[PDB]
Design an enzyme around this catalytic site. Structure first.
Site, PDB file in Angstrom:
ATOM      1  N   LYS A   1      -4.004  -2.044  13.736  1.00 52.41           N
ATOM      2  CA  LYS A   1      -2.627  -2.231  13.285  1.00 52.41           C
ATOM      3  C   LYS A   1      -1.758  -1.337  14.155  1.00 52.41           C
ATOM      4  CE  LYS A   1       0.163  -2.117   8.890  1.00 52.41           C
ATOM      5  NZ  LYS A   1       0.129  -1.676   7.449  1.00 52.41           N
TER       6      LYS A   1
ATOM      7  N   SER B   1       0.254  -7.547   9.857  1.00 54.54           N
ATOM      8  CA  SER B   1      -0.043  -6.818   8.614  1.00 54.54           C
ATOM      9  C   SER B   1       1.290  -6.178   8.210  1.00 54.54           C
ATOM     10  CB  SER B   1      -1.118  -5.760   8.786  1.00 54.54           C
ATOM     11  OG  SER B   1      -1.367  -5.082   7.545  1.00 54.54           O
TER      12      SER B   1
ATOM     13  N   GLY C   1       9.696  -1.336  10.817  1.00 56.81           N
ATOM     14  CA  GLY C   1      11.077  -1.259  10.445  1.00 56.81           C
ATOM     15  C   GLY C   1      11.944  -2.309  11.099  1.00 56.81           C
TER      16      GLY C   1
ATOM     17  N   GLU D   1      -4.791   2.305  12.371  1.00 55.39           N
ATOM     18  CA  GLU D   1      -3.399   2.166  12.670  1.00 55.39           C
ATOM     19  C   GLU D   1      -2.893   3.337  13.460  1.00 55.39           C
ATOM     20  OE1 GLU D   1       0.629   1.440  10.249  1.00 55.39           O
ATOM     21  OE2 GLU D   1      -1.168   1.280   9.343  1.00 55.39           O
TER      22      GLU D   1
ATOM     23  N   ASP E   1       0.832  -1.207   0.000  1.00 56.67           N
ATOM     24  CA  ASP E   1       0.000   0.000   0.000  1.00 56.67           C
ATOM     25  C   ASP E   1       0.868   1.260   0.000  1.00 56.67           C
ATOM     26  OD1 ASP E   1       0.298  -0.829   2.969  1.00 56.67           O
ATOM     27  OD2 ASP E   1      -0.765   0.999   3.353  1.00 56.67           O
TER      28      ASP E   1
ATOM     29  N   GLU F   1       0.282   4.275  14.558  1.00 49.73           N
ATOM     30  CA  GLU F   1       1.682   3.819  14.592  1.00 49.73           C
ATOM     31  C   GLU F   1       2.497   4.748  15.478  1.00 49.73           C
ATOM     32  OE1 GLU F   1       5.995   2.447  13.003  1.00 49.73           O
ATOM     33  OE2 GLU F   1       4.516   2.542  11.435  1.00 49.73           O
TER      34      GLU F   1
ATOM     35  N   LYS G   1      -7.389   0.908   5.101  1.00 46.71           N
ATOM     36  CA  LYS G   1      -6.396   1.250   6.097  1.00 46.71           C
ATOM     37  C   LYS G   1      -6.223   2.754   6.154  1.00 46.71           C
ATOM     38  CE  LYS G   1      -2.168   1.791   6.080  1.00 46.71           C
ATOM     39  NZ  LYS G   1      -0.750   1.614   5.688  1.00 46.71           N
TER      40      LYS G   1
ATOM     41  N   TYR H   1       4.440   6.951   3.582  1.00 46.92           N
ATOM     42  CA  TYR H   1       3.897   6.242   2.431  1.00 46.92           C
ATOM     43  C   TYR H   1       2.402   6.480   2.409  1.00 46.92           C
ATOM     44  CZ  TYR H   1       2.407   2.017   5.309  1.00 46.92           C
ATOM     45  OH  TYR H   1       1.695   1.117   6.134  1.00 46.92           O
TER      46      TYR H   1
END
EC number: 4.1.2.13
Lengths: 353, 353, 353, 353
Positions: A224, A295, A268, A182, A28, A184, A141, A353
């Protein structure tokens, strides 16, 4: 908010994706940020290369069927055809997988703050999700990012990110698309493991209150998150039993049980750390009332990418690398994973991204 | 959060707009909403019809130039040329006026709620404000909408339209554009004056908290609040002194004195009731440490639009109607105002544009 | 929440206390913390000394009538009699002053935080305020304290303190007692002036949202804040025009106009700095739609205390010192103050009482 | 926020209380509320009557000792001696039981609201918990009360009882006492089951956010939630499977798995309906990662209290009634339960104690 027919459809979809043994492949990356992954293996960033590379992943020869429930695709990848003319969603769906769609539109800064960001996407969202649903996507997502500095992640950022995550979730479920939420926490930093664990607890607490506030239907959601992990620049060393404890207690203290699964992002980490920690987690003795799977994007494609190396002649060679990792992670995702580009760390400062 | 030169530009820009006697013309209507305005006078919704109408308002004579310090424009009409070939922003900037741009992209439902809404437009707002600033705009408008009903405005609806307005304000100001935050409580309903007051108070309180929270610079903002009037379908009648005290109480309890000025919207009041109420408000004995003026859409153009009838022959009659409501209001916002299609209720249910 | 008869009574009381020229004398030290002020002048801390000392203050010979609207007394001081047998509330009320009562019960730590604190008091509050009302008190005070360290004042503390402040305010007005809402930011620290200004803006924003949330009636409130001031240990030097700008802009950006007055706390400034800054503030050109006066304790009693020196023979000598300062501050509180134990700084690390 | 030894003591203490099969007896009634209980069986409200009744319950035979791991006591009865001269806490600790103390000090109205309430008791709580810990108590109970009506539970009522429960939890845990946070939604009303669900969800979500916010240690907490039942005056009837799914859904969506266990209150259900519903709940196919048991007041003692009749002669009959409801419930909290004043509704309007 949602009828029952609509709650069965989401709950169904959500469980499908994280049925036992299965995870999600995150394919993605935005066009610009996939382009720098290709540059890594000296390949020009072109519609066909991108298509070719995505096609290689969606066409992996079938021992990945039990390991890959779903695939998140970037917007263009969903309107691209395999070489046989077949649209990529139909190629992957025929094999029993479910297609997902990245709908956020990248991050944007927050005035008055030490580098933090919202993300944006919500505008036109619901009509977009309507299209993405008709074109085969059953889940979406949305990536928000927080970082750990001393005055990062601020209340203002946690509040605004958990809120946009909740707006988006609510728009997705309106259109029968299971949202992937998500939050993160980036590994960027010197922070130790417990610091990260605390920030992850405060973030997820905030997200799940936000979801409650916006009346989103948790059984038709997945989450996620980052695992809980020392900062990249952290000098101190921490085991995988310690990362899996830290990660699992963090999740038991915030994520209500109704959440159908937790598909972890690679963060990562090297491809192999990712599978070891995923496994450790599933072997954590504590009680884990949700699906703890993966994922992964970069931690299922590092070996693949540097196999493929921009050259059509290794297609099979790259997709056997991809397969190996999916199988590794479909066992880590059961607790049954017993085991060197796969140990190359895949860390990226302010991953975008 | 903002440098001092930037805070100066914003503070200045905002004081120009709302200097003593000046008010704002809201010429900001969607091509979809100036549709229904043109059909109310038989005219077809054609670009040059829109261009002409807007041209009529912006080019009124310089007896109005102490009455109108700004014009909120819709996107289209910022980029139309007058008959001399001059871009519209210049025909107005030439006269010492200020060009405003509406940046919101309509409203959108909030799931989970009895009808409520949030507003969208933040995606790309950063760049858009940038362009719009280079092209003439020095201030922006974002409209949020709460209705009053029995479970309306929800807590979620208030906290979402608050933290969107703030996100928007934050972005305008970083791009050197003075945000007008419009938390409009609609007169749709049966409700008491005191009710509209309580809601109006609770809303502004959550707005100004939101602006605090995102580090907005109140000296380079304007509040575009509704008056506090009883519902459109309320049976009890309330005096112009009561409307005027309720409005000025509600704001004295929520609006930091730092705010540069407040631009009332017309809300559906008749042209004439807008001027009267604006005047009662400015004639209120209480102490009002901000500029209390108008940013009127329909309560400046109704007389002009009916006079215009679509017929190019009617231009100067159309405009001297506009000009009279501009002069009336430029005294009502000083207390000095004293006095039939300017008597008509301009109430659209659930107004949208 | 409150009838109109009840809103007139509070608004009345609140304006009385901060009518033009008048401030508040804070004679509300707890027994233990007054005891260390007495120890400063080598006097034993005894009911009679405390009584004597308070009596000296409430009996100051009448040029203080125009300068001292009100007096905050600690609980025991309100049940103590002048030497003529007359209860202290009646002694001070007969002269046209209004009695206030300290109702908080001191601070208490906040688990998990870097030294921060709530305060406590609310339990039994409403019945206490019922008594204090019948025994002559028409207003109350409640001190919350935040500090500025790097990770201080946290959201958690600001949220909980502004909330208890709002609980207490709401209980006071139920019982016709005007609440004094004191969010004191301590000067403890190295912080510069703008740091303090930002923390004060975020605090007051939070308090006034809290008050709105709890439906407290702002016209029947007063606010006792710190001025905005560099930290004690701050090396950099700041003028009184800069402290008065910092302080006034901080208040214009947070305190809605309906708040009837702002009675400043001394903060540990010297007696004379307190009057200079208070004056500077009132001379700030910016528009200040509330009463900007003083509710000083230590900055009206330093000279007095070290005059009195535990000895009955200087009573008149100490109360002429007290008077001088009240007059100084009743002019600073108009802008009309033109001018060496009064320059002794009165700073106290983690001031408690 | 808490050391590891301390988190161990709390976690342990909490797991003892709610180990498999064990539940809690709530013997926690005010002298004012056990008043009305004694008048319902003709007995006068005299210390030794209270002492005797409490003595009867605590000294039941050791067929109950796998059914009752804790007793919530009222202040008075923690400090009463049995007939052997033994302090009550020991007669119960001797048997392997745990002594709980109720620390709240009743409820108190929230101004601005249609009837709503907050709860008080935080003043001194720190020291009280300390003493209570030395004197036998190893866990505390604080009761908060929301009712369901048309504008009830307000946002303010929820956010205030949430941030009081958290303040309380924070204090118990620092003093080594396992808080039982009781957010009780009262069955007073006409409301649907689904309604009680939505409120119950929104409340727990705001609780667990509050506990997050104050850094509470969920492993050393217990939740004392209401079941989700329809209003007392609801006309529709709902099955024991529906009550049981609604309760277990509501909690699966809000209660982090980290919480050690949840102790349902009886709410007014008959003794027998409490056991049945507790049993349906534990027999629910969904996955419930916490201990689902009882902390019943009236649904353990009704049979015993009517049997007791005030007559010392009835002791062992009174208690073997108590003991039967203890055995019934100790299977209902395992699923193994299977089956006339134990059929009676024990509903007090607006229960208080």
């Amino acid at each position: 908010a949602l009828t029952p027919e609509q709650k069965k459809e989401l709950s169904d979809i959500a469980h499908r994706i994280v049925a036992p043994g299965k995870g999600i492949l995150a394919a993605d990356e935005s066009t610009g940020s996939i382009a720098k992954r290709l540059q890594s293996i000296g390949t020009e960033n072109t519609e066909e290369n991108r298509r070719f590379y995505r096609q290689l992943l969606l066409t992996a020869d079938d021992r990945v069927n039990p390991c890959i429930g779903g695939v998140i695709l970037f917007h263009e990848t969903l309107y691209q055809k395999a070489d046989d003319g077949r649209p990529f969603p139909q190629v992957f769906k025929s094999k029993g997988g479910v297609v997902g769609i990245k709908v956020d539109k990248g991050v944007v800064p927050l005035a008055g703050t030490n580098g933090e960001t919202t993300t944006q996407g919500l505008d036109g969202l619901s009509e977009r999700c309507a299209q993405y649903k008709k074109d085969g996507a059953d889940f979406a997502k949305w990536r928000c990012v927080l970082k750990i500095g001393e005055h990062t992640p601020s209340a203002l950022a946690i509040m605004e990110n958990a809120n946009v995550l909740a707006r988006y979730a609510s728009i997705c479920q309106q259109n029968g698309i299971v949202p992937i939420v998500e939050p993160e926490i980036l590994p960027d930093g010197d922070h130790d493991l417990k610091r990260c664990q605390y920030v992850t607890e405060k973030v997820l607490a905030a997200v799940y209150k936000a979801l409650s506030d916006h009346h989103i239907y948790l059984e038709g959601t997945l989450l996620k998150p980052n695992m809980v992990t020392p900062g990249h620049a952290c000098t101190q060393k921490f085991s995988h039993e310690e990362i899996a404890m830290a990660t699992v207690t963090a999740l038991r203290r915030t994520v209500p049980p109704a959440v159908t699964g937790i598909t972890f992002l690679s963060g990562g980490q090297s491809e192999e750390e990712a599978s070891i920690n995923l496994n450790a987690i599933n072997k954590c003795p504590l009680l884990k009332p949700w699906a703890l799977t993966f994922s992964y994007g970069r931690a299922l494609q590092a070996s693949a990418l540097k196999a493929w190396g921009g050259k059509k002649e290794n297609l099979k060679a790259a997709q056997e690398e991809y397969v190996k990792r999916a199988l590794a992670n479909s066992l880590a995702c059961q607790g049954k994973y017993t085991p060197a580009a796969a140990s190359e760390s895949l860390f990226v400062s302010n991953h975008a991204y």
